């Protein structure tokens, strides 16, 4: 039996769900010969009422170098980056839920991802299998990928379809714990774009630049636009697409008019739809935001590490698209 | 005596300070023949402890069309936009502290600003008189503008000069109520860029796009860099700059090495510095964040409205810069 | 028009209700030629979510000497005492809700009460008129006084009468904001005893010692004891009594078996029942705890001060009881 | 493997630390053939953020009679009493951190303590082994006992030595989770008196009344008094004392001038010092408050129970003091 020493960065929606999940599953962990021991939980304000014991809360400096794992759910880019890098350089793995971090700080983080030190299933579709799904898709060559990757905006669209207003659905999504602290990241497509970037790097090109993703959000959509789509036999969704144009991979996020019986239009939660050679058409759906959903992904990654598997390695090589593709039609 | 009926969107740092200021100052409004009456206060969580009566909290959106004024300080862009547009469409003014809303949703909001329906003193440097300062500066032709517009970042750099860490200073800024919900908006320069856009629109180009502001933040600054600057008789500040380059207005936010005796370097609080023709060089400074500071700006706008004055108008046309300029050196 | 500068000590149940009430009634205040201006609100922890704006919160040192009024609702004895005394010595009035303070620190505070500097209607039966009621009773001589002065214990008894348990009624009383932070003060009769002391000092003896009050609480009472009383045509209540025995005033707190149609048994809230010469029998009832109830008393006292009336002066002289008395029967 | 079914009363500083300790350490219980299973956790406000699953929170009292153990850390006296007595009546042990409950409700609880059904290590000096220390001290006849039992007051006086104010030190004690909900219980000596009563009951008189403890607190101490004491080679501490006077056991809590090199003056943490016959002079010290510290004591008691050992028994008879004693000088 031995201790698994965890340093947790962040004690919010995701971090507090993860802390409690780890201790709630300590019986599972003992079956792996480990007992979990948090070293501390990095937070901003120790006095906020919080679902972690106050005594475990930390302010910087919070030394990470005795940890067996750093788990990060702080949000942002530069603040987590400067904390994780000393632990990665010491060969301590990072399990993260932070797409922005990975999308925007890849020059610093790619070399550690290439060594198997970064686990980030929870950074795309929370604990819904998205990264593990694509890793198994490597058996084939991608033809086209289309996903609904932002939980907050999916929620809002679904609620507007039912005749509810944008502003009340946003408020709900925020209370549900789905939204980024800057909700424009959600609604402008940027969080989806971060996630798309990560999917491109795992599968098609380990250097795919976040700057190349074209993104636009849901700010022109209303219950009326969505109700008219429904009348045309369509559903409008924000869709993140990776597809071939000109022998290069293109990545875009935008509202799309989907056929209403398409898998993406009928998804139960966030969804990833792919066509690949020779596999064919495959699909995965589930919750894509929320504290418990996300904690599940982080804990899956923790079990993955205890198994002796490396983290999520980028694509070993960049390859052009086999097939010219396109997205669905945009919204006028 | 008649009611002045107010719908308040947001009951947080700024909205609660405002609510409580209006109540404390309510007797002042009797000079205009009114008593303030709040129709409702939009909030997310009506169970949080709050200095606003439970009976007035609305955890869902409510009808605004009986209001005399809508006051907004809820943060974000598309949600406040969609909530205020029907009021604006009905000729009900908006008083707002939300720079992001105005910077990012200007295609929608510009026409109402042009009609005098939008008051936003509190959206730049809180209740420090920045927008009224610039309104009087329109007597002259702008040569160049440089401000220190972000409260949080200024506070951080000043504390880091005094030996505190970046982290400790940020935390104290947050406890003081200065920061955006996502403090990267502060420290990456985005909030300063939103405010810079509004300044450009008021002065030189009423269609100035937020997207044309270049912004960087303070991520590369260490207490070393700040102390080397001091060794050079400089101070490093995040500065928002509006200046002519090639016959066109540029807008940029970045860390700048300032001479230590420049008004911007020395100012007590956030600061806005101009040169203009024929006035010369003028400067205003004061608190640029904080609930009470912001509530003062919102209430100043409410008194402006009660006086019969319109809101803050965009520049009546675009025009090119009279002179070529530049910012200070970067870091 | 002029400012009324208030220093508030305490921002809890009572203090936060008072702050908000003052600003909510600022239109009333202007009719008195004043505008209210808080100088600060003394609290322990500035980060607790709290129904006062964070910027107005203070930690010691909090200078009070520019105030026109100090309002205190901190609780305890020594902590408020050391803060109020410099303001009283400078001739600044105190409006307080703190019975314990006055009961236990009367050697220090009596001389200021005798000068008209202490207003404390909210210290007995919250904003229910109890002190003002007794002041008007001075037209007569007291024969006997009996009150139900503790809100928490009244609530618990009422709930147990309905078959609910002690522990769930306590929990409710606490959520309702009724209880002292040490709930044994309530349930052991001590808070009632503090209040009884104050009533004795206003009416019969300005030096009446808190140590002379005999107190016992409700800890032997159960739904069964109360249900049996009801069957006997009785109600059991904790009662605070001032009555003559031997030519001296005696003060006691204890459970009593009351006739079920007695005013004290049928009270709507906390209650004060007196017989006096030549007035006769008089009674006052209302809410005796709760933040808004209490804020009402503190604000009544603030209006009283703005009127030019002094605070609650102790009895000008000690007089023996005219009449030998007794309480109701105790509970076996 | 079988469930060890636990009903937890209280989910605060101590109850949540306990809950989370049991879960972290759960694998240890497999040595006894059990896995811990909580039947419910009694709390007042089930909406507060809490490190205990929402599904297990009970905002009202729930049936305890299927439990194997009741664990109590809810505070107060009559409410926990009424909640635990039916479990005790059914032969279900109680593990408690609540000194007040035991000190004040002993007429009710004594008979169950005598049957080995009450474990309360955590009620005195948290998980520092005070009660097991005294259990081994029963090999000897008590001469005198002196402790520093209140964590909050010790912390305050130590910080005031270092120049912090009384107020600032109290506030930090509260943020550290040390203080009672009413901190006057700490600083007036009442909490120390409750604990002193329990010590007397364990050692010398199983019926020792809480009401016979004399208690005063630290209200008269200033940083002056503490610095004059140091000038005299003394330290001032709140001390709980059990000693013979006139053939009877006295119990007192008060500020005492200690020689600065006495174990009590120097101790790292809260401390319990005895002299006994024929052992001599022995001493134990360690953390006396705090969630984790307390959870360690509760969990130590849970392991004690799983081992087959009874709870903490009162002294099997009263007896008079062997020797006359006294405390240190007062202040
Ligand atoms: N919510 C979801 O559904 C979800 C799902 C998947 C991925 N994510 C990603 O997971 C990450 C966390 O999201 P969230 O919803 O948990 O955020 P959150 O609720 O805002 O939590 C962030 C936490 O990190 C702390 N923190 C943030 N910046 C810090 C700094 N510079 N120094 C010290 N402490 C810091 C915060 O302190 P305080 O509590 O004291 O402020 C808080 O405990 C983000 O990267 C987000 O994009 C979220
Ligand atoms: N802080 C400053 O110094 C300052 C100064 C000038 C301008 N500003 C701007 O003023 C605005 C407010 O800032 P602040 O500091 O007051 O933020 P804050 O404390 O976070 O308050 C935001 C308020 O709006 C509510 N809210 C947020 N999103 C909502 C939604 N979707 N639906 C309904 N209610 C919602 C929140 O509800 P809950 O309370 O229920 O969460 C809260 O009452 C922002 O636009 C900020 O940029 C701030
Ligand atoms: N509740 C009622 O129904 C009621 C009715 C009438 C009279 N009373 C009396 O009114 C007084 C207040 O009662 P309450 O229910 O308001 O108490 P509460 O909710 O516990 O509030 C006490 C307040 O004073 C603060 N405080 C306490 N001691 C302090 C210290 N030493 N230094 C600085 N701040 C201090 C607290 O800070 P934090 O919030 O940061 O801890 C809190 O803001 C008591 O004397 C009580 O007997 C109560
Ligand atoms: N703090 C220490 O260092 C320490 C050490 C040893 C012993 N103790 C003793 O341990 C006990 C608990 O202390 P603590 O610091 O954990 O207090 P705490 O943080 O205030 O927690 C008390 C808990 O009990 C709940 N509660 C209180 N009264 C209740 C009622 N009438 N009905 C239902 N639930 C109720 C509270 O509910 P909410 O959370 O919903 O309010 C909270 O979960 C006390 O007896 C204290 O003397 C404390
Ligand atoms: N804000 C993100 C959280 C989950 O990654 C979303 O709505 O998808
Ligand atoms: N976050 C903003 C608040 C004031 O607009 C700032 O620091 O300047
Ligand atoms: N705890 C007190 C509050 C009101 O004085 C009671 O229950 O009466
Ligand atoms: N309030 C108690 C907690 C520990 O029993 C103390 O300070 O000692
Ligand atoms: Na995932
Ligand atoms: Na301004
Ligand atoms: Na009263
Ligand atoms: Na112990």
CB C238 within 8 A of CB C154: yes
CB A175 within 8 A of CB A167: no
Environment class of residue D248 by beta-carbon count within 10 Å: exposed (0-12), middle (13-18) or buried (19+)?
exposed
**Torsional sign, CA B192, B194, B197, B203:** negative
Residue A24 annotated as lining a ligand binding site: yes
What backbone phi and psi angles, to 5 degrees, belong to D253?
-120, 125
CATH topology of domain D138-286: Dihydrodipicolinate Reductase; domain 2 (3.30.360)
Q: What does the DSSP 8-state code read for residue A5? A: E
Structure tokens at C320: 């023996």
Going from the C-alpha of A299 to that of each of A104, A186, C249, D36, the distances in angstroms are 24, 25, 71, 22
C-alpha of residue A90 to centroid of ligand 6, in Å: 38
- C-alpha span between A195 and A98 (Å, rounded): 9
Environment class of residue A313 by beta-carbon count within 10 Å: exposed (0-12), middle (13-18) or buried (19+)?
middle
Give contacts of C49 with chain B, Cβ < 8 Å.
48-49
Q: What approach was used to elucidate this structure?
A: X-ray
Spell out the long-range contacts of C257-264 with Cβ–Cβ below 8 A and sequence spacing 24 or more. C257/C229, C257/C232, C257/C328, C257/C329, C257/C330, C257/C331, C258/C234, C258/C328, C259/C233, C259/C234, C260/C230, C260/C233, C260/C234, C260/C235, C262/C235, C264/C146, C264/C147, C264/C148, C264/C237, C264/C239
C-alpha of residue B293 to centroid of ligand 10, in Å: 9
Nearest to A218 by CA among A269, A266, A290, A148: A148
Instruction: Enumerate the domain spans of chain C.
Output: 1-137+287-332, 138-286
- Bridge-partner residues for C284, per DSSP? C272
Strand, coil or helix: B19 = helix
Instruction: Round the CA-based radius of gyration of chain A to a whole number and report it.
Output: 20
D195 is catalytic: yes
What backbone phi and psi angles, to 5 degrees, belong to B203?
-90, -50
CA A201 to chain centre: 13
C-alpha of residue D141 to centroid of ligand 12, in Å: 21
**Torsional sign, CA D90, D93, D96, D99:** positive
Pick the atom of ligand 5 nearest to A99's CA.
Answer: 5
Pick the atom of ligand 4 nearest to D72's CA.
Answer: 11
Quick one: CA torsion of B16, B19, B20, B24, rounded to 10 degrees?
A: 170
- C-alpha span between B156 and B164 (Å, rounded): 9
Helix (H) or strand (E) holding C26: helix C26-31
Number of Cβ within 10 Å of residue D147's Cβ equals 30
Instruction: Round the CA-based radius of gyration of chain C to a whole number and report it.
Output: 20
- C-alpha span between C275 and C128 (Å, rounded): 19
Nearest to C239 by CA among C223, C251, C225, C247: C251
**B42 within ligand 2 shell (Cβ under 6 A):** yes
Of A44, A75, A183, the CB nearest to B76: A183
Nearest to C221 by CA among C158, C309, C270: C158
CB D274 within 8 A of CB D282: yes
Structure tokens at B155: 């506070």
Going from the C-alpha of D126 to that of each of B269, C234, D74, D154, the distances in angstroms are 49, 46, 15, 14
Tokens 């070393």, located at residue: B224
End-to-end CA distance of chain A: 61
Pick the atom of ligand 2 nearest to B15's CA.
Answer: 16
Per-residue burial over A32-54, b = 16 or more CB atoms within 10 Å of its CB, e = otherwise:
eebbbebbbbbbbebeeebbbbb
Residue C87 annotated as lining a ligand binding site: no
The answer to whether residue B49 neighbours chain C at the CB level (below 8 Å) is: yes
DSSP string of D110-127, one letter each residue: HHHHHTT-EE-GGGTTTT
CB C140 within 8 A of CB C323: no
DSSP string of A141-194, one letter each residue: EEEEEEEE--HHHHHHHHHHHTT--HHHHHHHHHHTT-S-SSTHHHHTTHHHHH
Nearest to B190 by CA among B258, B225, B181: B181
Going from the C-alpha of D293 to that of each of B292, C275, D127, D266, the distances in angstroms are 42, 56, 5, 20
Number of Cβ within 10 Å of residue C232's Cβ equals 11
CATH number of B1-137+287-331: 3.40.50.720
The answer to whether residue D48 neighbours chain C at the CB level (below 8 Å) is: no
- C-alpha span between A239 and A143 (Å, rounded): 16
Please report, in range form, the residues annotated as the binding site of B for L-homoserine: 180
Give contacts of C51 with chain B, Cβ < 8 Å.
49-51
**A276 within ligand 5 shell (Cβ under 6 A):** no
Give contacts of D20 with chain A, Cβ < 8 Å.
23, 53
- Count interface pairs B-C at CB distance under 8 A: 49
Number of Cβ within 10 Å of residue C230's Cβ equals 12
Q: Which residues have C-beta within 8 Å of that of residue C27, sequence separation ≥ 6?
A: B26, B27, B35
CA C82 to chain centre: 21
CATH topology of domain C1-137+287-332: Rossmann fold (3.40.50)
Number of Cβ within 10 Å of residue D49's Cβ equals 10
- C-alpha span between A312 and A118 (Å, rounded): 6
HSE-CB at A306 with a 13 A cutoff on CA atoms is 21
CB B71 within 8 A of CB B122: no
Instruction: Kindly give the pairing relationship between strand B248-259 and strand C94-96.
Output: unpaired
The answer to whether residue C208 neighbours chain B at the CB level (below 8 Å) is: no
Give contacts of C165 with chain D, Cβ < 8 Å.
61, 82
C-alpha of residue C9 to centroid of ligand 3, in Å: 8
Q: What does the DSSP 8-state code read for residue A327? A: -
Residue C66 annotated as lining a ligand binding site: no
CA angle C308, C310, C314 (to 5 degrees): 165
- C-alpha span between D18 and B254 (Å, rounded): 50
DSSP string of C109-142, one letter each residue: HHHHHHTT-EE-GGGTTTTSSSHHHHHHHTTSEE
Q: Where are the beta strands (DSSP E) in B89-200?
A: 94-96, 118-119, 141-148
Options A5, A162, A195, A228, the catalytic residue: A195
**Torsional sign, CA C132, C133, C138, C142:** negative
- C-alpha span between B75 and B86 (Å, rounded): 18
C-alpha of residue C42 to centroid of ligand 8, in Å: 25
Of A44, A174, A184, the CB nearest to B77: A184
Ligand that lies nearest to the alpha carbon of residue A165, given by its number in the listed order:
2
CA distance C291 to chain D (A): 18
Structure tokens at C134: 């007794």
CA angle C79, C84, C89 (to 5 degrees): 140
Helix (H) or strand (E) holding B244: strand B234-245
Tokens 């020395």, located at residue: B266
Nearest-Cα residue of chain D relative to residue A30? D27
- C-alpha span between C275 and D107 (Å, rounded): 39
C-alpha of residue A81 to centroid of ligand 9, in Å: 21
Strand, coil or helix: B278 = coil
Residue D14 annotated as lining a ligand binding site: yes
> A: neighbours with 3+ CB pairs under 8 Å?
B, C, D
Number of Cβ within 10 Å of residue D324's Cβ equals 12
Nearest to C149 by CA among C188, C187, C193, C113: C193
Write down how long chain C is: 332
Going from the C-alpha of B128 to that of each of B20, B75, B239, B292, C106, the distances in angstroms are 19, 20, 17, 11, 49
How large is the greatest C-alpha to C-alpha distance in chain D, in angstroms?
62
Residue C99 annotated as lining a ligand binding site: yes
Of A27, A36, A52, the CB nearest to D51: A52
What backbone phi and psi angles, to 5 degrees, belong to D237?
-140, 150
Per-residue burial over C238-274, b = 16 or more CB atoms within 10 Å of its CB, e = otherwise:
bbbbbbbeeeebbbbbbbbbbeeebbbbebebbbbbb
- Count interface pairs C-D at CB distance under 8 A: 57
Instruction: Resolution in Å, one decimal, please.
Output: 1.9
**Torsional sign, CA A64, A70, A74, A77:** positive
Structure tokens at C82: 């050391």
DSSP string of C210-222, one letter each residue: GGG-EE--STT--
Environment class of residue B285 by beta-carbon count within 10 Å: exposed (0-12), middle (13-18) or buried (19+)?
buried
Nearest to D142 by CA among D240, D212, D243: D243
CB C111 within 8 A of CB C48: no
Per-residue burial over D163-175, b = 16 or more CB atoms within 10 Å of its CB, e = otherwise:
ebebbebbbebbe
Structure tokens at A140: 């084939």
**A289 within ligand 5 shell (Cβ under 6 A):** yes
- C-alpha span between C48 and B293 (Å, rounded): 22
The answer to whether residue A47 neighbours chain C at the CB level (below 8 Å) is: yes
Environment class of residue C283 by beta-carbon count within 10 Å: exposed (0-12), middle (13-18) or buried (19+)?
middle
Strand, coil or helix: C66 = coil
- C-alpha span between A142 and A272 (Å, rounded): 13
Environment class of residue A127 by beta-carbon count within 10 Å: exposed (0-12), middle (13-18) or buried (19+)?
buried
> Which of B50, B127, B291 should be substituted to probe chain C, the one whose Cβ sees the most C Cβ atoms within 10 Å?
B50
Q: Where are the beta strands (DSSP E) in C56-211?
A: 57-58, 69-72, 94-96, 118-119, 141-148
- C-alpha span between D119 and D94 (Å, rounded): 6
CB B67 within 8 A of CB B39: yes
CB A131 within 8 A of CB A121: yes
Residues of A (149-178) whose Cβ lies below 8 Å from B: 165-168, 170-171, 174-175
The answer to whether residue B31 neighbours chain C at the CB level (below 8 Å) is: no
Instruction: Kindly give the pairing relationship between strand B141-148 and strand B270-277.
Output: antiparallel
What backbone phi and psi angles, to 5 degrees, belong to A279?
-50, -55
Strand, coil or helix: A42 = strand
DSSP H helix total and E strand total for chain C: 13, 12
> Within A176-257, where are the H helices?
184-187, 190-203, 223-231
Strand, coil or helix: C95 = strand
> Which of A82, A107, A160, A171 should be substituted to probe chain B, the one whose Cβ sees the most B Cβ atoms within 10 Å?
A171
CB contact under 8 A, C47 and A48: yes
Q: Which residues have C-beta within 8 Å of that of residue D204, sequence separation ≥ 6?
A: D142, D242, D249, D315, D318, D319, D321
CB B52 within 8 A of CB B81: no
Going from the C-alpha of A226 to that of each of A148, A164, A217, A237, C198, the distances in angstroms are 16, 11, 14, 9, 69
Give contacts of C45 with chain A, Cβ < 8 Å.
47
Q: Which residues have C-beta within 8 Å of that of residue B62, sequence separation ≥ 6?
A: B7, B39, B40, B42
CB A118 within 8 A of CB A260: no
Residues of A (52-111) whose Cβ lies below 8 Å from D: 52-55
- C-alpha span between C311 and C315 (Å, rounded): 12
Tokens 């119990």, located at residue: D251
**Torsional sign, CA D96, D99, D101, D104:** positive
Give contacts of A35 with chain D, Cβ < 8 Å.
24-25, 27
**Torsional sign, CA C103, C105, C106, C110:** negative
Helix (H) or strand (E) holding C23: helix C13-24
Q: What does the DSSP 8-state code read for residue D204? A: T
Spell out the long-range contacts of C264-271 with Cβ–Cβ below 8 A and sequence spacing 24 or more. C264/C146, C264/C147, C264/C148, C264/C237, C264/C239, C265/C234, C265/C235, C265/C237, C267/C148, C269/C125, C269/C128, C269/C151, C269/C154, C270/C125, C270/C126, C270/C128, C270/C147, C270/C148, C270/C149, C270/C150, C270/C151, C270/C154, C271/C147, C271/C148
Structure tokens at A242: 């990776």
- C-alpha span between A15 and A72 (Å, rounded): 8
Nearest to C278 by CA among C145, C147, C139, C133: C139
């Amino acid at each position: 039996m031995e201790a698994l020493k965890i340093a947790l960065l962040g004690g919010g929606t995701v971090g507090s769900a993860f802390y409690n999940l780890v201790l709630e599953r300590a019986e599972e962990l003992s079956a792996f010969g480990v007992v979990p021991r948090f070293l501390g939980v990095l937070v901003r304000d120790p006095r906020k009422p919080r679902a972690i014991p106050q005594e475990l809360l930390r302010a910087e400096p919070f030394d990470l170098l005795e940890a067996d794992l750093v788990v990060e759910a702080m949000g942002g880019v530069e603040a987590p980056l400067r904390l994780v890098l000393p632990a990665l350089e010491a060969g301590i793995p990072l399990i993260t839920a932070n797409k922005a971090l990975l999308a925007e700080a890849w020059e610093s983080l790619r070399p550690f991802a290439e060594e198997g030190l970064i686990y980030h299933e929870a950074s795309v579709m929370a604990g819904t299998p998205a990264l593990s799904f694509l890793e198994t898709l490597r058996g084939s060559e991608l033809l086209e990928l289309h996903g609904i990757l932002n939980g907050t905006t999916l929620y809002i669209l679904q609620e507007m379809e039912k005749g509810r207003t944008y502003a009340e659905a946003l408020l709900e999504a925020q209370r549900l714990g789905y939204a980024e602290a800057d909700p424009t990241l959600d609604v402008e497509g940027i969080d989806a774009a971060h996630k798309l970037t990560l999917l491109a790097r795992l599968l098609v090109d380990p250097g795919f630049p976040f700057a190349e993703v074209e993104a636009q959000g849901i700010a022109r959509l209303t219950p009326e636009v969505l109700q008219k789509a429904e009348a045309r036999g369509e559903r409008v969704r924000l869709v993140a697409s990776l597809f071939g144009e000109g022998g290069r991979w293109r990545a875009a996020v935008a509202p799309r008019r989907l056929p209403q019986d398409h898998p993406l239009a009928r998804a139960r939660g966030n969804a990833l739809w792919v066509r690949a050679r020779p596999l064919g058409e495959a699909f995965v759906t589930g919750p894509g935001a929320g504290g418990g959903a996300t904690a599940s992904g982080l804990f899956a990654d923790l079990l993955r590490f205890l198994s002796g598997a490396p983290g999520h390695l980028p694509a070993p090589r960049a390859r052009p698209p086999l097939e010219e593709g396109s997205p669905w039609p945009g919204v006028e």
